[PDB]
Design a protein around this ligand. Structure first.
Ligand SMILES: *N[C@@H](CCCCNC(=O)CC[C@@H](C)[C@H]1CC[C@H]2[C@@H]3CC[C@@H]4CC(=O)CC[C@]4(C)[C@H]3CC[C@]12C)C(=O)O
Ligand SMILES: *N[C@@H](CCCCNC(=O)CC[C@@H](C)[C@H]1CC[C@H]2[C@@H]3CC[C@@H]4CC(=O)CC[C@]4(C)[C@H]3CC[C@]12C)C(=O)O
Ligand SMILES: *N[C@@H](CCCCNC(=O)CC[C@@H](C)[C@H]1CC[C@H]2[C@@H]3CC[C@@H]4CC(=O)CC[C@]4(C)[C@H]3CC[C@]12C)C(=O)O
Ligand SMILES: *N[C@@H](CCCCNC(=O)CC[C@@H](C)[C@H]1CC[C@H]2[C@@H]3CC[C@@H]4CC(=O)CC[C@]4(C)[C@H]3CC[C@]12C)C(=O)O
Ligand SMILES: *N[C@@H](CCCCNC(=O)CC[C@@H](C)[C@H]1CC[C@H]2[C@@H]3CC[C@@H]4CC(=O)CC[C@]4(C)[C@H]3CC[C@]12C)C(=O)O
Ligand SMILES: *N[C@@H](CCCCNC(=O)CC[C@@H](C)[C@H]1CC[C@H]2[C@@H]3CC[C@@H]4CC(=O)CC[C@]4(C)[C@H]3CC[C@]12C)C(=O)O
Ligand SMILES: Cc1cccc(O)c1
Ligand SMILES: Cc1cccc(O)c1
Ligand SMILES: Cc1cccc(O)c1
Ligand SMILES: Cc1cccc(O)c1
Ligand SMILES: Cc1cccc(O)c1
Ligand SMILES: Cc1cccc(O)c1
Ligand SMILES: [Cl-]
Ligand SMILES: [Cl-]
Ligand SMILES: [Zn+2]
Ligand SMILES: [Zn+2]
Lengths: 21, 28, 28, 21, 28, 21, 28, 21, 28, 21, 28, 21
């Protein structure tokens, strides 16, 4: 999930768009 | 777990801006 | 719409804290 | 929805729990 | 009351920075 | 109090120092 | 000390929400 | 105090209530 | 002026995310 | 400037890009 | 890079308050 | 720059004033 994905290595704003509804 | 808590706060603020009118589904 | 944008930012921060491990579904 | 509900009149933390997954 | 809630959030963030090591006493 | 003082008219950082411990 | 500074910012935001009308006393 | 208590190990919202006035 | 102060806080947080590595120049 | 532009009427993220360095 | 991202968010909020009417120039 | 300066060791508000316009 997003914490595992984005809290150790940095996530781009593009990656974050995956979690938009 | 504190670092993950702090990070999550920032993740949700970013999702709010990125997702706009669509909104988002946050689950840790 | 600016006031609603500012309010939404605070709503998502509150949901993050209130909902904890459950997470939440934000849609305006 | 939540913006209509909580951005003109104030919402309690109890009301916000409805939007938790 | 919503506007006051939003304002209070910013007041506490400012007090945190202004007051430093002293801390502060927040009461609405 | 601080909400009455600082949420209608703007407060300086100097005014906010009054609430420091 | 930076990590503690960042953490404190989040602590005060959480206390604001948790404590509501009561307010709170923050001291590091 | 709260920084020692809550910045290395995580604090519950219930623990944070101790610091409410 | 309070509303503009609150808005500015959110503007700078959005610019931080939007601008990334470029950074930004904030002037009211 | 940005406060006049974006604090009465809402600004898109695209508009905010103008202020990036 | 995540820690630096989180820190930068707080840096910009502090600069907003410290700099007031002057504004500021943020570059990582 | 500011990230190198202020994200490993802590910066005072006085140090941050250098970045004001
Ligand atoms: N948001 C993401 C991920 C969410 C995934 C859904 N949650 C779970 O699967 C629940 C897992 C919990 C029960 C465990 C995760 C970490 C565990 C702790 C780790 C440290 C110790 C290890 C030990 O030996 C027992 C105690 C300990 C505290 C663990 C307890 C159980 C956990 C909390 C998504 O939505 O996908
Ligand atoms: N988050 C909540 C609510 C989300 C509801 C789902 N979205 C919609 O139903 C979309 C409605 C949009 C298309 C309209 C809402 C407000 C309208 C504008 C209001 C001002 C003027 C009015 C006019 O005469 C036309 C232009 C104008 C800008 C409108 C455009 C259309 C709207 C944006 C949930 O999830 O339930
Ligand atoms: N933080 C500051 C100020 C805190 C002051 C300490 N609190 C009080 O004195 C409590 C006052 C409360 C009980 C009332 C303030 C506003 C009232 C409401 C206003 C709208 C209507 C008015 C009405 O006719 C009755 C209902 C209504 C909702 C009121 C209810 C009572 C109040 C909430 C410091 O620390 O100094
Ligand atoms: N908020 C909490 C806790 C607040 C406790 C009240 N403050 C103090 O007791 C002040 C203690 C200060 C003076 C010291 C704490 C950490 C010290 C530094 C640690 C690193 C080095 C160590 C060294 O050898 C000297 C220099 C150094 C920078 C220390 C300086 C002194 C301290 C800052 C509550 O309210 O209960
Ligand atoms: N960030 C933007 C815009 C920044 C523009 C650069 N600043 C100025 O041009 C300074 C203007 C100041 C001196 C005035 C703006 C608003 C004025 C006040 C309005 C209310 C009353 C009006 C009155 O009769 C006198 C007192 C009063 C308080 C005014 C004082 C002067 C002002 C603060 C960018 O960078 O472009
Ligand atoms: N804000 C401050 C500082 C900004 C300084 C201006 N930017 C640069 O000078 C750009 C430097 C970039 C291109 C590199 C910095 C860190 C590098 C990465 C580090 C880890 C590995 C190392 C490696 O062997 C190659 C890949 C890797 C990801 C590096 C890529 C290049 C960098 C991103 C100011 O304004 O002064
Ligand atoms: C934008 C953002 C916030 C928090 C963590 C990340 O990896 C990315
Ligand atoms: C907690 C919270 C944030 C924003 C609006 C509200 O009504 C309530
Ligand atoms: C710094 C600050 C925050 C909120 C309200 C104010 O009047 C001032
Ligand atoms: C809610 C919260 C914020 C910061 C640190 C913690 O342990 C808990
Ligand atoms: C993204 C954002 C923040 C503040 C005001 C705006 O118009 C837009
Ligand atoms: C005020 C502040 C924020 C972030 C990092 C620092 O060193 C100082
Ligand atoms: Cl606000
Ligand atoms: Cl952080
Ligand atoms: Zn706000
Ligand atoms: Zn943070």
């Amino acid at each position: 999930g997003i914490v595992e994905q984005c809290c150790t290595s940095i996530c781009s704003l593009y990656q974050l768009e995956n979690y938009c509804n | 777990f504190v670092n993950q808590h702090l990070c999550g706060s920032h993740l949700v603020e970013a999702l709010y801006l990125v997702c706009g009118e669509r909104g988002f589904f946050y689950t840790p």
